[PDB]
Design a protein around this nucleic acid. Structure first.
Ligand SMILES: [Mg+2]
Ligand SMILES: [Zn+2]
Ligand SMILES: [Zn+2]
Lengths: 72, 1333, 99
DNA sequence: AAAAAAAAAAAAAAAAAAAAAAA
DNA sequence: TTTTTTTTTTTTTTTTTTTTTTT
């Protein structure tokens, strides 16, 4: 990835984008839980941004999954 | 994990609650062993174990009985670092006063007990017995007594009377006080008081009582009874190189205090005579004061030598003060440095980082990815592998830096772009390469400039460096919307060369194909690069709604132009590149690509333009041979003619026909004329001048001379400098500044002479020194601005107001420069834009004015639209997102959080060093418009203006103002309002000097009250050799005639007294003093008869921001009404204003020398300039109010910055203004405690009115007061910040006594304490944390 | 040129030792702090101030996370706040926290 | 008397007096 | 015409060598 304009409108704020992407990247770095999109030698953080742009990752989704496993 | 901070006076139980146990013995060590004597100053059980996870007894050992209090030695088993925080306390034998509240200067204890500092110190330091409940005696509670008076009091009433001497006496006084009764009585007195100083002191007392009431604090804690003791580590014992332990400097204070207190306990238990124990208490009070802050009350004690020793308070003061510590500067790790080197072949988001520096920055990352991969599992093996330069470590380092943004920071970081962040790509050697295009924001120049490389460690920081700061997400700089990735020096020369029309060259006259065959033609060398030829470019224009509509057609172009067209992305139209792309058209092309196809295509297109510019610049080989600085052949002839001219002028001056000054001015003028001639000649020889065959006859085309090619392209060097290279290099001003009479008559190509060059050195060195000084000047200005702007942060999505300023194109005296386009671009409209056609709403109310809406404004040509402004947004401690507009760094509306104060301050900063340290002729087609119009047909027949502040505008045929000129009073106006005035009319006309007394009607002159010899004099003016009457002022006229005012009760032809048209009173024109009444008595005047012949750099910006009042301010009419010269001759003339709408309450004195533009009696609206001259800002707020001080400050400073070359958007000045005037004086009691004399932050009074009107209460009115940025920074809303501005002890004392809770708001308190800077990621994090609660 | 990752630290300031003559890293002066504040970037500033200036525990923890392969700061108030708090509490001042 | 350790290398507070205003 | 209050303008106070202390 080079620019992050596509991710701005997906999470409108450009800072909540940063923290949400950091949440997903931390999940994908040591919290296992491989990315849902293929990687191209990309770091975990860029994969998080990529999936955010793909729309399949958002703060709501992360919270839903965290709550679901916290019920376990 | 820490919301707002609270500070308050500590209760003794609080102090004892801050300890595990009490110290009771002053001892340091055994001096034989390391024995921490029980209850010692470093007691093990009060502070912790000396060695980690140990008991002094040594029973338990190092983990097993962890966190166990040894039953024998009574010591926890924890790490030695626990010793760092375990506070202790020393119980005082007697209450002892706290010096800080005694000597806050003004003392808080003082007004708390409302006693003179002298007597309170007498009682405190044991030389007087205060009276305590004097009761039924001649003495009274507030009274004090010296020793003899106390003895006498004991003699007379020594049965029930009570009086004690010492700190404990002050404590008892504090026990005897009921602040509620004090509140009631002092508010009553404030109601009774009239003396403003009396009200001020009483309100100081009432604010004290308000503090103690609202705050939970109680005044009795002012007198300490338990002194806390810091943990031993924070006061390190620092053992000397011997058996003794060098007990710091504070520990010495503890030694003295503890010894004195133990001896006081001993004396109390033994009950020694009162004199000895009184002396002991005095010594203990002195010792405690010294412990608090030694050197404040008495002479500071010292250490071993005479040199004074510090104190606990010094820990909160000075450079080592732990308030201003994270601000001085931190040598951050993972840093770097290097010299810089150009980096073509890099993309626009890559920074070539050296190998030898990238294996010492990402070292730990290499360790991680190396040990994890198993190449060397143990860490020490990984270290020895990297230091062994083994080939695998290069691969691992490449992997880790695959995507791990680095931050490249230039030295002076004025802009917010000066910490841009790139991806790394590894080169060899040692030089931080750097993409060429991004050399502008940094401002580096590759002549030794050095940039530092930081790295973000934590994953959040990595995502920030890739999202918020990456070099490819900052095409638009903060201040000015247009791009700051703009092709600069060689890329533009390459583009220019690659597209230029040559009349005839190889490949002329043919039709090839689309661009591909054009590049094929050029590479093969068949067709020259410049070849006017038709090709088949196809353009994908966005004519349809978001659709690439493709159209192709045989279009003329140049072969090079077709070649360059391949780099333009799809969306742009072809004509975007068909000119000869300069530095202007190229930036316009790049900006258009931005607006039409978004961001990422602009980055791709900037890369491509830089590359295809460098390549063809090289293949051109544009080189500056000396022979291409052509000199005019007419130069010597023109200079000879100028020399003859000055010769004749000088000879004529020698004959006396022309004075020295006129001769000098004429000489310099003719030198300027000759210089213009030579400049035109050389610019004509350089430009054009290339005559060549076109395959038929000859014709001329724009030349290809490398100097002219550069200058026309705008690569580097405009017409002025090439003029200096070939034409005369001007007239260099002497060191004072006066222009030298004899200019330099030799360009650089020809030689200079010792005299001429020695002259040029003057201007050169003056320029250098002035730049060196303006460096620090701009630095100071930025610091003040960011000091008063850092408070803000965009924290509200919408304040839902309606009071947005109304923006109009700004007219510089007939020279409208900024249309409504810019100064309303993006900023959100407040009211729905209404088309000039009635009832036709153009755009809704709360809508963003992006480029298309601006285009709609242009097509409708709206001359005024109401735009929301941050100068007045209904928010508590921030500023509405909608009310700010676009961020002007990304385009969309500013998202919640992004700090604008430190955006503004820097944008109004960095472009500071660039800052340098009779009749109107209508020129356009339009109609006459007049503002503040009160005119009438004159005797001359044209017109006379009877209004002072009249202004004349030229409304174009579109119904839009274009030109505007301030019409002086008593001006001859040929036409009137509402008459067609095409481009060329000269309607405006007036005397540039003199202040004529025009009589708007006819009537015979009458010297009613103008007695000759007492008020006027029939003086024989020998200029025209005629007798004229001259009015005499108070000094010139007789004192007896002083009352006799020089009135002119004109009488009409019928002889009746001329009443002013529309008034019953006579037209008794009171002429001013020293006026020249040319007309005589019995002369029939006419309309407008003239009777009395009455006669940039940084500092300006700082003055405008610092609200520095002018030295001779223009005086305005504080209230609407008719003016009346009141009492005179009292040093300053007294002037009264009589509101015709109401009473006449307002009057004041004004200097006699300060001339008045208005006569004795004239109906003047408020704001009428009583006198002209420089205009103060603060009075504009006083009268015009907010939304007018804005349109003054923003207009003035943005004019000063538009003066030179820069473009500071108005949002930044507006937020600095908002921060400037966030405090208002209270106008009425309303229903809250707010006294009229009090001044409080405008937010506080705003919310006060909000909550009072929500209920049945009544709000308190206010008047917002302007404060200079230095003044505003001195003013504070957060005690940590004010601590950051020194006077730390005063701030702490005031906050503690007031119980002044402080928001962790604004970006300077959080940095000092160290939490998340609550602006961006920090702000979202904090709001999330609050939400989870 | 002068790189720096975890070289010799200072005496009393306990920051990384400054100066080219002793393996020093570039100084992060105030104006750069403003430069970061203008950007929303906060964690990078918070780490330029705490986990790479003086926080020994933070420094060690961050080094552990980096070598262990985890990119994560440790959320919590810098100990400098705690030192200042105890300094004030030395004086008879409550200086308590809030929510 | 020699050696070792500490520190040095204009702004504003207060008050006298002059001038205004009220009795 | 005399006294009191308020203003304002003037004054005065706030990394190396040497010095003081210790043996
Ligand atoms: Mg340079
Ligand atoms: Zn023990
Ligand atoms: Zn607003």
């Amino acid at each position: 990835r080079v620019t992050v304009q596509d991710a701005v409108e997906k999470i409108g704020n450009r800072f909540d984008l940063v923290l949400v992407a950091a949440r997903r990247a931390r999940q994908m770095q040591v919290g296992g839980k491989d990315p849902l999109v293929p990687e191209e030698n990309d770091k975990t953080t860029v994969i998080a941004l990529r999936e955010i742009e793909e729309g399949l990752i958002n703060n709501q989704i992360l919270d839903v999954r965290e709550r679901q496993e916290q019920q376990e | 994990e820490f919301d707002a901070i609270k500070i308050a006076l500590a209760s003794p139980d609080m102090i004892r609650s801050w300890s595990f146990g009490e110290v009771k013995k002053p001892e340091t060590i055994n001096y034989r062993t390391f024995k921490p004597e029980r209850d010692g100053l470093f007691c093990a059980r009060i502070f912790g174990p000396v060695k980690d996870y140990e008991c002094l007894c040594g029973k338990y050992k190092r983990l097993k009985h962890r966190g166990v209090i040894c039953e024998k030695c009574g010591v926890e088993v924890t790490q030695t670092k626990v010793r760092r925080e375990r506070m202790g306390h020393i119980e005082l034998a007697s209450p002892t006063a706290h010096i800080w509240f005694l000597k806050s200067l003004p003392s808080r204890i003082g007004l708390l007990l409302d006693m003179p500092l002298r007597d309170i110190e007498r009682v405190l330091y044991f030389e007087s017995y205060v009276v305590i409940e004097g009761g039924m005696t001649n003495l009274e509670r507030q009274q004090i007594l010296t020793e003899e008076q106390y003895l006498d009091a004991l003699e007379e009433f020594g049965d029930e009377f009570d009086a004690k001497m010492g700190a404990e006496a002050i404590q008892a006084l504090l026990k005897s006080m009921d602040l509620e009764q004090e509140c009631e009585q002092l508010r009553e007195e404030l109601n009774e008081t009239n003396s403003e100083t009396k009200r001020k002191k009483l309100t100081k007392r009432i604010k004290l009582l308000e503090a103690f009431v609202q705050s939970g604090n109680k005044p009795e804690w002012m007198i300490l009874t338990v002194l806390p003791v810091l943990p031993p580590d924070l006061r390190p014992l620092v053992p000397l190189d011997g058996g003794r332990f060098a007990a710091s400097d504070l520990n010495d204070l503890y030694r003295r205090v503890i010894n004195r207190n133990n001896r006081l306990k001993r004396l109390l238990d033994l009950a020694a005579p009162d004199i000895i124990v009184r002396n002991e208490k005095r010594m203990l009070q002195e010792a405690v004061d010294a412990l608090l802050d030694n050197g404040r009350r008495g002479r500071a004690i010292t250490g071993s030598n005479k040199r004074p020793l510090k104190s606990l308070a010094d820990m909160i003061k000075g450079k080592q003060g732990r308030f201003r510590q994270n601000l001085l500067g931190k040598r951050v790790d993972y840093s770097g440095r290097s010299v810089i080197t150009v980096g073509p072949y890099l993309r626009l988001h890559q920074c070539g980082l050296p190998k030898k520096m990238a294996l010492e920055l990402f070292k730990p990352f290499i360790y991680g990815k190396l040990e994890l991969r198993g190449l060397a599992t143990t860490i020490k093996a990984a270290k020895k592998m990297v230091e062994r330069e083994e080939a695998v470590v290069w691969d691992i380092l490449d992997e880790v830096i695959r995507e791990h943004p680095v931050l490249l920071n230039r030295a002076p970081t004025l802009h917010r772009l000066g910490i841009q962040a790139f991806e790394p790509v590894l080169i060899e050697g040692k030089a931080i390469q750097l993409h060429p295009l991004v050399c502008a924001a940094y401002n580096a120049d590759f002549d030794g400039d050095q940039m530092a490389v930081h790295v973000p460690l934590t994953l959040e920081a990595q995502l920030e460096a890739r999202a918020l700061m990456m070099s490819t997400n900052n095409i638009l700089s903060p201040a000015n919307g247009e791009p700051i990735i703009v092709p600069s020096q060689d890329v533009v020369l390459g583009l220019y060369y690659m597209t230029r029309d040559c009349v005839n060259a190889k490949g002329e006259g043919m039709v090839l194909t689309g661009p591909k065959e054009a590049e094929r033609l050029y590479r093969s060398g068949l067709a020259s690069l410049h070849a006017r030829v038709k090709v088949r470019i196809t353009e994908y224009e966005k004519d349809a709604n978001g659709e690439l509509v493709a159209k192709t057609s045989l279009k003329d172009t140049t072969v090079g132009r077709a070649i360059l067209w391949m780099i333009v992305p799809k969306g742009l139209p072809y004509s975007i590149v068909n000119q000869a792309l300069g530095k202007k058209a190229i930036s316009k092309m790049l900006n258009t690509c931005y607006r039409i196809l978004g961001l990422k295509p602009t980055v791709i297109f900037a890369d491509q333009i830089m590359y295809t510019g460098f390549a063809y610049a090289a293949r051109s080989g544009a080189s500056v041979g000396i022979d291409d600085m052509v000199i005019p052949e007419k130069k010597h002839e023109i200079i000879s003619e100028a020399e003859a001219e000055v010769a004749e002028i000088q000879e004529q001056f020698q004959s006396g026909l022309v004075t020295a000054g006129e001769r000098y001015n004429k000489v310099i003028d003719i030198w300027a004329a000759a210089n213009d001639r030579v400049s035109k000649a050389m610019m004509d020889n350089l430009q054009t001048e290339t005559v060549i065959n076109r395959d038929g006859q000859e014709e001329k085309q724009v030349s290809f001379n490398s100097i002219y090619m550069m200058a026309d392209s705008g690569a580097r060097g405009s017409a002025a400098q090439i003029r200096q290279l070939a034409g005369m290099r001007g007239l260099m001003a002497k060191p004072d500044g006066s222009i030298i009479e004899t200019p330099i008559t030799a360009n650089f190509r020809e030689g200079l002479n010792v005299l001429q060059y020695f002259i040029s050195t003057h201007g050169a060195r003056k320029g250098l020194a002035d730049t060196a000084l303006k460096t620090a000047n701009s630095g100071y200005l930025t610091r003040r601005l960011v000091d008063v702007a850092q408070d803000l942060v965009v924290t509200e999505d919408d304040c839902g107001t309606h009071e947005g300023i109304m923006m109009t194109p700004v007219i510089e005296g007939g020279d409208v420069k900024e249309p409504l386009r810019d100064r309303v671009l993006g900023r959100v409209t407040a009211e729905d834009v209404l088309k000039p056609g009635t009832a036709d709403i153009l755009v809704p109310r709360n809508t963003l004015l992006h480029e298309q809406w601006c285009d709609l404004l242009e097509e409708n040509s709206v001359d005024a639209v109401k735009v929301r402004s941050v100068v007045s947004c209904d928010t508590d401690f921030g500023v509405c997102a909608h009310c700010y507009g676009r961020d002007l760094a990304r385009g969309h509306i500013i998202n919640k959080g992004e700090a604008i104060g430190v955006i503004a301050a820097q944008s109004i900063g960095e472009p500071g060093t660039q800052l340098t340290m009779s009749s109107i002729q209508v020129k356009n087609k339009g109609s006459i418009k007049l503002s503040n119009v009160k005119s009438v047909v004159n005797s001359s027949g044209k017109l006379v203006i009877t209004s002072r502040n009249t202004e004349l505008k030229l409304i174009d045929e579109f119904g839009r103002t274009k030109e505007s000129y301030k019409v002086p009073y008593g001006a001859v106006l040929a036409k009137g309002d509402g008459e067609q005035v095409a481009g060329g009319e000269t309607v405006a006309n007036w005397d540039p000097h003199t202040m004529p007394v025009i009589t708007e009607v006819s009537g015979f002159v009458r010297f009613t009250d103008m007695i000759d010899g007492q008020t006027i004099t029939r003086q024989t003016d020998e200029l025209t050799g005629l007798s004229s009457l001259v009015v005499l002022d108070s000094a010139e006229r007789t004192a007896g005639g002083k009352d006799l005012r020089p009135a002119l009760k004109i009488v009409d032809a019928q002889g009746n007294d001329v009443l002013i048209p529309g008034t019953d009173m006579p037209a008794q024109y009171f002429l001013p003093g020293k006026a020249i009444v040319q007309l005589e008595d019995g002369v029939q005047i006419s309309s407008g008869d003239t009777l009395a012949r009455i006669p940039g750099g940084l500092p300006r910006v700082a003055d405008l921001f610092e609200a520095r009042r002018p030295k001779e301010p223009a005086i305005l009419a504080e209230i609407s009404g008719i003016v009346s010269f009141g009492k005179e001759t009292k040093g300053k003339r007294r002037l009264v204003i009589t509101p015709v709408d109401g009473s006449d309450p307002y009057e004041e004195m004004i200097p006699k020398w300060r001339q008045l533009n208005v006569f004795e009696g004239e109906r003047v609206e408020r704001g009428d300039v009583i006198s002209d001259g420089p205009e103060a800002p603060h009075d504009i707020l006083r009268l015009r109010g907010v939304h007018a001080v804005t349109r003054y400050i923003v207009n003035e400073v943005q004019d000063v910055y538009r003066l030179q070359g820069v473009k500071i958007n108005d949002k930044h000045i507006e937020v600095i203004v908002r921060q400037m005037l966030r405090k208002a004086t209270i106008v009425n009691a309303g229903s809250s405690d707010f006294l009229e004399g009090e001044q409080v932050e405008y937010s506080r009074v705003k919310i006060a009115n909000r909550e009072l009107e929500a209920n049945g209460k009544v709000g308190a009115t206010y008047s917002r007061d302007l404060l200079g940025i230095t003044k505003a920074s001195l003013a504070t809303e957060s005690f940590i910040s004010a601590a950051s501005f020194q006077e730390t002890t005063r701030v702490l004392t005031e906050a503690a006594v007031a119980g002044k809770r402080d928001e962790l708001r604004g970006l300077k308190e959080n940095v000092i304490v160290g939490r998340l800077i609550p602006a961006g990621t920090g702000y979202a994090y904090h709001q999330d944390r609050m939400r989870r609660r | 040129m002068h790189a720096r990752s975890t070289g010799s630290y200072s005496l009393v300031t306990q920051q990384p030792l400054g100066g080219k003559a002793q393996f020093g890293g570039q100084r992060f002066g105030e104006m750069e702090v403003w430069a970061l504040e203008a950007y929303g970037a906060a964690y990078t500033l918070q780490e330029m101030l705490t986990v790479k200036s003086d926080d020994v525990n933070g420094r060690t923890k961050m080094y552990k996370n980096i070598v262990d392969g985890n990119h994560q700061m440790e959320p919590g108030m810098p100990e400098s706040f705690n030192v200042l708090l105890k300094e004030i509490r030395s004086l008879g001042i409550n200086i308590e926290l809030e929510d």
